[PDB]
């Protein structure tokens, strides 16, 4: 499997009117997110910045990237939709090239892209104002998880995949920034979770079981529990 071509990616995605201002690829690092936070922490403006790592402390079998966004100009109660928008971007960028029926793949709230029941990719948002750092990990050539390879992509072009992924990610971030109602609708159309019976595990061995009915303006899960609405903030759920 070839390495990423840093130069080609830059020619493609930067700049004008692209929202990506910078992009770097590094052979190795611990976290893409930490590296980016370190940079902001130290006074860097990381909005629009992409960091890709060939390996995170096997190498080059996943696409791992992180992006930075300035969120401060957006209402704090909509930040929660940013990590959701990111998964949609991953599913969208990867669906066209996939053997399975689109219906078998979907979004699992709040962090996961699933194909045929197995985790294709994960999303990690960490906030650090004025920024949020979105981290993506997609299994290209890798518990019970899955990869584009297992999914029929015979030879995946990480360069092409990363490139498409950044393009959708840019599209969704824009929609999120614009309070676009389509982002939420697109997210619902592809949710595995909505319409599903789910259990939410809560600290202390507590759990709630209900039917996921919607996602609220803040990105939280709405459960129908016997006709009462219970809303939960981002956390982990199990389908049933």
Author numbering: 8 to 64, 77 to 161, 168 to 265
Which text from the study accompanies this structure?
Acetyl Coenzyme A Carboxylase (ACC), an important enzyme that catalyzes the first reaction of fatty acid biosynthesis, is biotinylated by biotin acetyl-CoA carboxylase ligase (BirA). The Mtb-BirA molecule is composed of two domains; N-terminal domain 1 comprises of 7 β-strands (β1: 29–32, β2: 55–59, β3: 82–88, β4: 124–126, β5: 131–133, β6: 137–147 and β7: 150–158) and 6 α-helices (α1: 13–20, α2: 39–48, α3: 95–114, α4: 173–176, α5: 183–203, α6: 206–215), while C-terminal domain 2 is a SH3 domain with 5 strands forming an antiparallel β-sheet (β8: 220–227, β9: 231–240, β10: 246–250, β11: 253–257 and β12: 261–264). All the apo BirA crystal structures have revealed the presence of disordered flexible loops, which undergo a conformational transition upon biotin and biotinyl-5′-AMP binding.
Structures of dehydrated (dhMtb-BirA) and hydrated (hMtb-BirA) Mtb-BirA, were determined at 2.69 Å and 2.8 Å, respectively, using crystals grown under similar conditions. The presence of water molecules in the hydrated structure keeps this loop in a closed-compact conformation.
